[PDB]
Structure formats: C-alpha cells, structure tokens
Design a protein around this ligand. Sequence first.
Ligand code: NAI
Ligand code: NAI
Ligand code: NAI
Ligand code: 9TY
Ligand code: 9TY
Ligand code: 9TY
Ligand code: 9TY
Ligand code: MG
Ligand code: MG
Ligand code: MG
Ligand code: MG
Ligand code: MG
Ligand code: MG
Ligand code: MG
Ligand code: MG
Lengths: 328, 328, 328, 328
Amino acid sequence: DKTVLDANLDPLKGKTIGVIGYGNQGRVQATIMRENGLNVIVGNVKDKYYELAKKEGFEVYEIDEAVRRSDVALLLIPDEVMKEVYEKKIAPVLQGKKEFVLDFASGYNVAFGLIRPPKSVDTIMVAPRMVGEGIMDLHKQGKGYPVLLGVKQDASGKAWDYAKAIAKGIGAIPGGIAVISSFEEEALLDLMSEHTWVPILFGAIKACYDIAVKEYGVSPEAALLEFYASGELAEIARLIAEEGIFNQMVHHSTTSQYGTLTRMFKYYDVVRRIVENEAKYIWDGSFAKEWSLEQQAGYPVFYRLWELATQSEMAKAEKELYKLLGRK
Amino acid sequence: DKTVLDANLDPLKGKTIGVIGYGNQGRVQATIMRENGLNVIVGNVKDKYYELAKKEGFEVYEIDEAVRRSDVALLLIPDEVMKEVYEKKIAPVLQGKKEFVLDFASGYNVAFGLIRPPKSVDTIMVAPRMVGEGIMDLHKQGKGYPVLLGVKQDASGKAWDYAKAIAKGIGAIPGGIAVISSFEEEALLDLMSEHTWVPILFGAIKACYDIAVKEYGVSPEAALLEFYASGELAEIARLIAEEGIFNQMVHHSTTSQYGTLTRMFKYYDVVRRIVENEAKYIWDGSFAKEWSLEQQAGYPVFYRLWELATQSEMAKAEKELYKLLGRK
Amino acid sequence: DKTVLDANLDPLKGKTIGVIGYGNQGRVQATIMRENGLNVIVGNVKDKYYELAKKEGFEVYEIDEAVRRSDVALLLIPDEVMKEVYEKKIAPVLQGKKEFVLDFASGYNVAFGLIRPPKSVDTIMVAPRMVGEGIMDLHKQGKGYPVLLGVKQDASGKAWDYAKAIAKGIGAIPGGIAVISSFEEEALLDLMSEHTWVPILFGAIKACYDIAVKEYGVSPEAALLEFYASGELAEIARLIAEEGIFNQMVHHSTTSQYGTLTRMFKYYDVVRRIVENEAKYIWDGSFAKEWSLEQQAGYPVFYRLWELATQSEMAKAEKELYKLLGRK
Amino acid sequence: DKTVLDANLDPLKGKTIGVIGYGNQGRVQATIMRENGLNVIVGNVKDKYYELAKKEGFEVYEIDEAVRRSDVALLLIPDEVMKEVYEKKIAPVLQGKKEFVLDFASGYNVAFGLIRPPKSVDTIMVAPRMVGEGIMDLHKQGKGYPVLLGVKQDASGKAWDYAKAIAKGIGAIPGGIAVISSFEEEALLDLMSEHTWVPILFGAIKACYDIAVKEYGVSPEAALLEFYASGELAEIARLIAEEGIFNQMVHHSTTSQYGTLTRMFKYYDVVRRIVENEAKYIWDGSFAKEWSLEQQAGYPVFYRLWELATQSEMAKAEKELYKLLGRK
Ligand SMILES: NC(=O)C1=CN([C@@H]2O[C@H](COP(=O)(O)OP(=O)(O)OC[C@H]3O[C@@H](n4cnc5c(N)ncnc54)[C@H](O)[C@@H]3O)[C@@H](O)[C@H]2O)C=CC1
Ligand SMILES: NC(=O)C1=CN([C@@H]2O[C@H](COP(=O)(O)OP(=O)(O)OC[C@H]3O[C@@H](n4cnc5c(N)ncnc54)[C@H](O)[C@@H]3O)[C@@H](O)[C@H]2O)C=CC1
Ligand SMILES: NC(=O)C1=CN([C@@H]2O[C@H](COP(=O)(O)OP(=O)(O)OC[C@H]3O[C@@H](n4cnc5c(N)ncnc54)[C@H](O)[C@@H]3O)[C@@H](O)[C@H]2O)C=CC1
Ligand SMILES: O=C(O)C1(C(=O)O)CC1
Ligand SMILES: O=C(O)C1(C(=O)O)CC1
Ligand SMILES: O=C(O)C1(C(=O)O)CC1
Ligand SMILES: O=C(O)C1(C(=O)O)CC1
Ligand SMILES: [Mg+2]
Ligand SMILES: [Mg+2]
Ligand SMILES: [Mg+2]
Ligand SMILES: [Mg+2]
Ligand SMILES: [Mg+2]
Ligand SMILES: [Mg+2]
Ligand SMILES: [Mg+2]
Ligand SMILES: [Mg+2]
C-alpha cells in the first residue's frame, strides 16, 4: 500500500541542510539528523533558544545566512506569523538561488496559498503527530515513529526520493512508518480534530457538571471527581492506543458497554452533520480568513473567551479542589 | 431623453491632459485623443507597458510629474490597489493644485468612499461597457460607441460640459451614444451582472452535466458538446445583440420556444428574490468590505476556489476533449 | 473511448439514398454527400424549397417515390407533425419493402414511441449540434464537425457500420468526431438545455432590469447596455468555446472572478434541484404529452406568452434603443 | 373619458351586412338594424331557427353565400365549435375577398388565437352584457343599452368609426353607452365572474344548508326558505342595480349592516388571493386549453358534476318543496 517502511539516504549526503528553529521539533529532529551522519546548520532568533542551540553545539548563523549556505531548508517555526518572516527575510535570499528544496511541519500556510515559493524549488512536507517529547521517549528506545509526507512542487523529478531521504534523516523509518499525503489532507486533519471532537467533549463535560449541580442538588466535588478530576480518561485513552477503541471496552462492565453502544449508534447522525459543516468550512479556506483577520484586529475574541472559560463555576471549583489534593 | 448624441470639444483645447496608464483603455483612448487634436501626456509604471507606450510616441514622465503638468487626469488603472497609489503618490501632488478635474473608468473606489479627493477638484466618470478591443474594431470603421457619464463633485459649474468634452475626446459620440449616470449606478450594474446571471448560468451548466452523467448513464463528451463545447451560445448572443432577445427565438423551433417561455415565466420569482438579496448586499457597501478584507488576508478563498473549479470532473473532461479537437 | 475519428464508406456505395427535405440540413448534407461520390435523390413538398432543390440539380420526386427507389431514407423534417406524414404517406410504402434503413436528426418522435417502424428496418440516428450554417462555414475550410449517433433497431447486424458509413457520408469525420448514443440521450440533452439554463438566464436578465429600474430608479438605456444590448456575452461565449469555461475568466478582473466564483458555489444546489425536476419530467414522457396536446388545442398558451413577452417594458425600451443605434 | 354617447352611421349605409345566426342576439340585433335603415342578410343552419328567420322576413342564404355578398360579417354563434366552422366554411370564402370586416360577441376564440383571420380584414368586437331579452325589454321603451367595443386588426384606418357605426346600427347609443376595450378585457371579465363570485356564492349557500341541518337539528324546509327559496336575493340585486351596492343596505336593519360590514372587511384578503390565482390562470391561456381538451375527450367531468349536483340532498329537498308551492 501507500505506506513506506524504509528507504534510502542518498540525496542528502554531500549537501548542507538548513534547520530553521530550535524549539521542540527543531532541536529533536536536528540532533537526530546530526547523529544520523549529515552536515547541518541552524537558523534562529537570537534569544534563550539560541543560547540553548549554540549550547548543544550547533553553529547558528542568521536565518538568511543559513539559507545561503544550504541547498535545503526546513522551516520549523509557527503558523501564525511565518508569512511576514518569509516575505521579508527569506524570499529575497531564496530568489538568490536556483535549485532549492523546502519542507514544513504543517501545510496551513501553503495549502491555502499564503506562501507561494517559486517554481525553482521542490516543495514538500514531513509531519508527525506527537507533541514532540514522545519522539525522544521513543528514540532512546531505538524505535521509529509515524509521519505524513507530501509534495507540493517538483522541479527536479526527485521530490519524492528527497522526501524519503529526509524521512530516514530524522529517525522515523525504520521503526515507525511514513505516509504520503498532500499538504491539504494534513491541514484538513489537524483542524478537524481541533474543531469537532475535542470541543464537543469539553462542552459535554461542562454541561454534565452544570446540570448535575443546578438541577439534582449534587456537590461540585463529586461531579469533578467523576467526570475529569480522576485519571479515568487517561487509562481509557492508553488502552485505546494499545488494544483498539472497541476491544478496549471489554475491561468495562456490561452495563457500560450496553449504554455506550446504544447511545453511540443513537447520536451518530447529529455529529455527522456537524462534522460535515466544519470540514466544508475548512476545505474552502474560510477559517484561514477568519483566523488571519482575528490576528489583524488584536485577538479580542480570543481574550474574552479565555476570560469567560476561567471565570466559570467549574473552573473555580477545580481550583479549590486541585489545591486540596496538592496538585499544582 | 437623458441620452446625448453629440456635444462640444471646447474646454479641453488649450489645456494639457493627464493619462495614467497604457493598458487596454489607456492606449486606445489616448491614441484616439491624440488623433482628435489635443495635447496629452502619459504616466505609467516603468515596465513593458512603458516600453510600448514610449514606443508609440507618447512622452511618459512619472505619475506625479504628469499630474503637475496637467490640469486634468484620467486614472485608467485597476480597482483593487488604486487606493494606496492615490494615497502616496497622487494625493500630495493634487494637494499642490487648485483647479483640477479627475475622471475614472469605474466608480467602485469612489462610490464607496475609498477615495475622497478635495473640494478643489471636479469629479466625474466616463465608462464604456466593452472589454476594449471592440472599440478599435469600431473606430477603424469610423463608428462610435456607447458609454456612461457621471459627476461626483462640481467646483466649477462646468463638470458636465467637461464631461461631454471628454466624451467627444475619445471618439464615442458622434457614432455611439453617451448616457449620464451617477458613479453609484455604474458600480451597481457592473456588479449585479458579475453576481447574478453569470454565476447562475455556470452553475446550471455544471449541474446539468453532473446530473446527466451520474443519474442517466451518459458520456461526458456528448454532454460537453451539447451544453457549451459547441459555439451555439455565441451565435445566440450575437443574434440577441442584433435583433432583440425575444425576436431572436423565431429562428428556433416551436418546441424550444414553448419550453423556454413556460419555464422562464415559471422561475422568474426565485431569481428575482436572489437578485434582490444581492443588490441590497451591494447598495450598503458590504461586498466592498468583504473584498478588501480578502485582499488583506492573502486571497485564500480565491485560491481554494480556483483550485476546486479546475479539479472538477467537467474541467478534466473538457481538457481531454479540447485536446482532441486541437483547441489549445 | 466511445469516440470515433474515422471509418469506412463501403455499405452506401452501390445503393440509392433517400433524402427527405431540402431545408437547412437537407441541403447541406445532401450537397455534401453528392460531392462525396454517391447516388442520391430528394423528396420534398413542392414549394419554394422544391424550386431551390431542383435549382441546385437534384432530381426530386414525390416523397413516397423517393422511398420506393431508395433502400435508405433520411427524414430531415420537423418534429411536430412528422407523425401524421409518416402515418399517411410513408408507412404504406415502407410496408412495401423488406430491407430498409431509416435515420433521423432528432430522437423526440422515436424515443417516446410516436413512431414505431417495423422490425424489417434498421433504425438509427445521426445528429449534429450546430444550427446548420456553421457546417458550410467549416466545410469550405475542409474541416469536420462532431455529431451523435444512435441505433434503435438492428435487423441486419450492420446498423453500426451503416451508421459510420453515413457519418463519413456527410463530411464530419475525418475532421470532427462522432459520438455513439441512444436516441434517448439525444432528446434528453436537446431538451434539458431548452428547459434549464436558457430560460433561467433570460429570467435573471429580465429581473435585473426590472429591479434596477423600479427600485434604484436607473435609466432603461444604461441597464440594457450593461446586460445584453452589448456584445459582451458573445465574446465570453467565444472565449469559452476556444479556451475553456473557467480558463476564460483569466481575462477578467480579480473582482469579477471572486464574486462570480463565490456566488456560483453558493447557488449550485438550487439550480441542481430544478434540473433534477425537469430531467425527471422528461425521462417519463410527460413533456411530450403536454406539447402534443398544446398542438391539438390551438397553441393558445404559446400565443399569450409570445404576446406578454413582447408587450413587456424591457422589449419596448429595446425597441426604442435598437432603433437609435440603427440596428434593425 | 373613454365612453361614447353617440356617433355617426355613415360607413354602413351603401354596403351589405352579413348576419350569421338568428338566435337571441342575432334576431334582436338584426331586426333592430333592418329597422335602422340598412340592407342586411342572414346566414343560418337550416333548422327551426331558419324557419323562424325566414318567417320574420329575412332572406337567408347559406353561410358562405351571405359572406360572398356582404363586405361585413357578424358571427353571432357559439364559442365552443365556432373554430371548425370557420376553418371549413368561412376561411375559404374570406380568402376570396380583399376588404372585409368581422365582428364578434365574445373575444374568447380570438384573444387566445384559436382564430387568426388574414391581415386583409379589420377585426373588431361589440359585446353587450345582458342575456338578450332585456334588450327588447328596453328597445320598446326607446332606450339604449351599454356595450363593449374592441379592435383587433385595422387594415383600413377606419376600424374604430366602423365600430361606432355598427354600435349605432344596433340601437345602443344614443340611450345607453359604448365602451371601448380590447378583446382580452372582455374575455377576462366574462370569465372572472363565472369563476369567482358565482361559484363561491353557490358553495357558501350549499355549505350553510349542510351545516345547519347536520349540526344544529334544523328542518330542510326552513333552511331553503331562508337562503334562496325566497326571492330576497332578487330584490337585493334590483336595489343594487338601482341605487348602489352599499346605499342599498340602508333599507336593512342596523344589525344586518353591522355584521355584513365587519365580516366583509374581515374576509377580503382570502377571496382576493383566490381571484388573483384565477385571473392569472386565465391571462395565460390555460383555461382555454383545459376546456378545449375537455371537449375533445367527451365531456366526462361535465357529466359527473352535473350528476353529483342534482343528486345532492339540497336538490332533492328543493324538488319536494317547489312541488309543494306549485313552482314548476
Ligand atoms: N507540540 C507542538 O507545538 C507541535 C508543533 N507542530 C508544528 O511545528 C512547528 C512548531 O514546532 P516547534 O518550533 O518545535 O514548537 P514552538 O511552538 O515552541 O516553536 C518555537 C520556535 O519558534 C521560533 N520562533 C518563534 N517566534 C519567532 C519569531 N518571531 N521569529 C523567528 N522565529 C521565531 C523560535 O526559533 C522557536 O524555537 C509548527 O509548524 C507547528 O504547527 C507540529 C507537531 C506538534
Ligand atoms: N477589460 C477590462 O478589464 C476593462 C476594465 N475597466 C476599468 O478601467 C480600468 C482599467 O482599465 P485597463 O488599464 O485598460 O485594464 P488593465 O487590467 O490591463 O490595467 C493595466 C494598467 O494598469 C497600470 N498598473 C497596473 N498596476 C499598477 C501599479 N502597481 N502601479 C501603477 N500602475 C499600475 C498599468 O499602467 C497598466 O497599464 C479599471 O477601472 C477597470 O475597472 C472598464 C472596462 C473593461
Ligand atoms: N437549424 C435547426 O433548427 C436544427 C434542427 N434539427 C432537426 O433537423 C430536422 C429539421 O432540420 P431542417 O429541415 O434543415 O430545418 P427546417 O425547420 O427549416 O425544416 C424545413 C424542412 O421541412 C420540410 N417540411 C416542412 N413542412 C413540411 C410539410 N408539411 N410536409 C412535408 N415537408 C415539410 C420542408 O421540406 C423543409 O425543407 C429536425 O429534426 C430538427 O429537430 C437539428 C439541428 C439544428
Ligand atoms: O464509570 C465507571 O466507573 C465505570 C462503571 O462501569 O461503573 C467503568 C465505567
Ligand atoms: O438545442 C438545439 O439544438 C435547438 C433545437 O430546437 O433543437 C435549437 C434549439
Ligand atoms: O470586471 C469587469 O468590470 C467586467 C464587466 O462587467 O465589464 C468584465 C467583467
Ligand atoms: O335576513 C333578513 O330577513 C334581514 C334582517 O335584517 O332580518 C333583512 C336582512
Ligand atoms: Mg494544529
Ligand atoms: Mg494534530
Ligand atoms: Mg467589473
Ligand atoms: Mg461590465
Ligand atoms: Mg431542440
Ligand atoms: Mg441543441
Ligand atoms: Mg360567458
Ligand atoms: Mg357576462
């Protein structure tokens, strides 16, 4: 199938590589690659992270100076401002090149056209799904992790083998796997989650609390303990990742199984409608517009919501409680 | 009636004129006027068009330098960015004047207040309805073409005679006609079309294709031939422009006449509702806001839609076919 | 694929052919075929067209006399009355034959069962999509045109090779193409257009006019100029036929592109519903019934609608105007 | 105003006139005109009416023979079959003429295009509103009556003076009046009544009966007496025609006035909607189609409804009663 379990490491040996950033990924992938036998460099904003980067023994010039030396570049930096940075400090230099290759972590800014490099650069993606620390929590085990790969532009007939070259350049396969996928799919996915089941879950919890308290005379403490103040959810998620989502439930009681299944098959249509709406909203590019404007206005809504959430009853009760249990 | 079939040419003889741009209109109208016995100049961004302009024998200074010399100016340039250009490079100079006159092709930026020149300048419009090449395709015939005229500000009691002076300064009347109309009407009209019957037409065609294929076992080729791959529509539009929209249908079969008329009178209310909605959306200024913001965000939606349209089935089939017929 | 770019001319050489009519197609296809090296004849109502036909040097007997001599027949005549004519003057003669072949331009009368020849005749279709004059406008260029082919009944195991034989007998391939398709598809298509996007377009235009005038108090002249009195639509249709429907819009302004695309994707569902309704109405045979009855009653509705359309405001204004521009 | 109170009698003196029919109008208008000093003739189906016509001293040839002799013709015959009769026995003869004039009582068959005489005949209407006997009930009083006039085609520049000539040729003005009006208006009106307030009235009466009987234990006799078996309605209608519709109610009780007015203003919208629907149904020509087909099928619905109405309870009770009162 489309999967790839291992590949070559040929095109990247003999060239220099441009690593932009020393954050979570940047540091991890960069240390990995240096340890994989390649000549690499770093570009970074000269701050605490730069201290740490030069600390770990990576020569770090300015951004553009790392792009002039390298024939490849990895932009391991945020999604919200990368645009301007590319416009000012990277586009000129890049125009000062002929054969180049650029790879990202996320496809947001590219899939939606906020960044359109020239046709003189093969354009690709390599994206994992962790938060980042798990990857050292796997590398010290000699394992490998799974990732997504994409190609946006090929001016060399070699974008894909460069893709797998990079892949093995970061220690994913062999040991994990590597999926090939457009930029579009990656963004669509990373957003659907952030828009569909996470917020639904949180709202459902909040509603259960509010109801139980204001309509059946219950104590906040008990509600919090039942719903999320206990690590129940964590164990469930672990068992899911290990055994399977459904096979997991065998370790539960029959009553739980019955209720869960019935209600699941009973509410599947509603959430389906919701998911359709949101995925459509995304495929078109509307959310990108919304978010970019919200940046351009001063993050007001962001602010007010961050306020309301914390000033809710549930949060205050959680505060009193976590204090009681010593949890910070 | 409000029409005007010919007028004078007095106020423009003895003055200099400022022509901003050498594109489609700029070149045509400018060559026309030079050939109409006037002293004119050109302002242009120094690029290929500037090469062509100085090629055809028009002294072309910088924009502001053409405004300092001229007592009139014609801004024959786009609608999406003209704002900034006026703010930086034209407003100062114009402030360095007392009696001036400015005329545009479109009323978008003025009707909605994105450009507010001083009360020391008579403000007007002169707009034709072609794409531009038809106008030489008429001038070499010695004909004249129809246009729209408007006045936004009059500080001379002469805005209108300047209007008709310009009109005859471009070779429209005598030979065509000249309508007088606010900036607002022009914009309203140029937008209603672009929002109402064009997109409806395209969507209807697309839907006919999709249906015929996916629900009655038809070949893409036949559908494309029937609907638009044939030049039927072109001949129909020509006959419309020549004889009249309805009188045109006499050259059709009775069956076609019957079905067309019945269905037309059957669906008139729906589209009427739609048109009402859109015209209202415009009269208020909302669309201008939408579009300006979409510029300020990075044209994401534009991008995604341009993608989806081309990646549709109909387009791919059209590709294979046009290839077969040799059509580029 | 199903297409055919060229084929043989064997079965038609050595036989006589029956051409019924000398109208648009009849004359064109007949002259073409005579010029393609075949023995042909004509049948016609003895009137002006008969004068013109015998003028151009085609021996023209009575209809039935041309069917007795020919082993093939092409019924190149209307769709509304052909029934009776076949019942009286053609069915008897045809019954006086054993091996025969009949081909039409349109599949209306056959697809719906208004004409059911015997099982002793291979039944087929050959239909182009022009209005007819374009085909000489292509033949004098030595080109070829596209057409649709169908087979309703085969009593010879040769209906298809007869089909392609005829095809090349009229000068379509090589130079154009030839699609194979049931009678049903042809009728369905020729009707969907006449019921879906043509009338919608006209109604939308009419509504735009009415609104702009009676709501914003604009001048009729300007509205007419913007919407259809200008040949804008013609150039657009030409560019469509040449480049492609979407690629066409590159020659427009970004504003137009944006509005058009958004609104297109915004109204696709409505027109889809409409098209579904009408196509269903057709597939069943209801429209044929409606139309046949309307013939049998005296064309009242036809009359009243032809009246209302012309007595509308838009038409009167168009009259005054076209008069002004010299357009007949 | 548009009214006409008297006019000339010039164009009809010196010519012959063609009177088709000797029914209600035919006899009345014909006798009137003969008595008005003109040379006239009659055409009639040779039956009892022909006996009566030749009885009263009118030479009566065959239809076509009366059209060959006359330069004018009046078609004073029904609306349901006149079509065929004109097609067979009148159109040929008429084609055997150059300057002719044709006038009707009703505009049904013309307004809807079921009859389209040549452009060599001025086409007009003259229609009264009685049932016909009232007109002698006025002529023996030396009065005059009101009528409607229309012109469909004028090939003489004299259609209107011929109109008024005819008008005075039948004894309407002076003494009554004469309104000018298209064929369309006449048909629209004569139908609206027959579709809107007559049937509504009858249905309301029927419903009142049914309700009163089946839901409040009332005797049929009393209901019939109250609603219509009494001549109340007749006196009311007379007073309406004499004094005015509203001024009429002064002769009623205050209670009646109050209830009537309140309920009238309370139900005006509903019936308005209904009337709109029906008038629209007519303006388009649909009803003509419906009726013509119902003729072509065998008058089934007509039959079944004529049955149901008479086999209703109300009718049987009316039978028993009218028998009791001696009313036939
Ligand atoms: N746990 C996470 O946050 C993960 C992030 N990603 C994606 O990877 C990229 C970010 O990953 P990380 O950098 O490791 O996490 P991070 O959010 O801590 O990024 C910090 C890095 O961004 C650079 N940076 C920040 N502001 C800058 C500025 N104004 N100018 C120049 N450089 C600036 C800094 O060099 C810094 O090292 C994004 O594309 C993100 O969508 C994907 C998987 C998980
Ligand atoms: N076919 C069409 O596009 C027609 C356009 N109009 C209107 O006329 C005006 C445009 O007419 P055209 O110039 O002939 O079409 P265009 O799209 O070819 O405009 C090109 C001209 O714009 C100037 N220009 C472009 N970018 C510039 C920049 N950054 N800075 C300075 N100058 C720049 C250039 O001098 C160039 O000559 C607009 O108001 C438009 O709405 C009206 C009728 C038809
Ligand atoms: N140009 C068009 O309108 C198109 C029409 N078609 C189809 O082709 C056929 C008609 O094409 P054309 O004849 O070229 O156009 P047409 O509509 O001008 O047909 C005129 C021909 O019909 C014959 N005709 C008319 N009335 C007759 C009668 N009472 N009795 C005997 N013959 C009579 C005449 O011989 C005359 O030559 C139809 O099936 C039509 O649906 C297909 C493509 C384009
Ligand atoms: O909510 C609980 O604690 C569970 C139960 O079955 O009682 C395990 C699911
Ligand atoms: O769609 C067609 O080709 C037309 C027909 O009447 O068949 C001309 C309209
Ligand atoms: O962009 C514009 O202004 C167009 C017009 O309506 O004239 C070409 C589409
Ligand atoms: O129905 C009646 O008899 C009337 C009354 O007022 O009682 C005259 C109207
Ligand atoms: Mg994310
Ligand atoms: Mg994620
Ligand atoms: Mg526009
Ligand atoms: Mg326009
Ligand atoms: Mg057709
Ligand atoms: Mg067609
Ligand atoms: Mg009547
Ligand atoms: Mg009446």
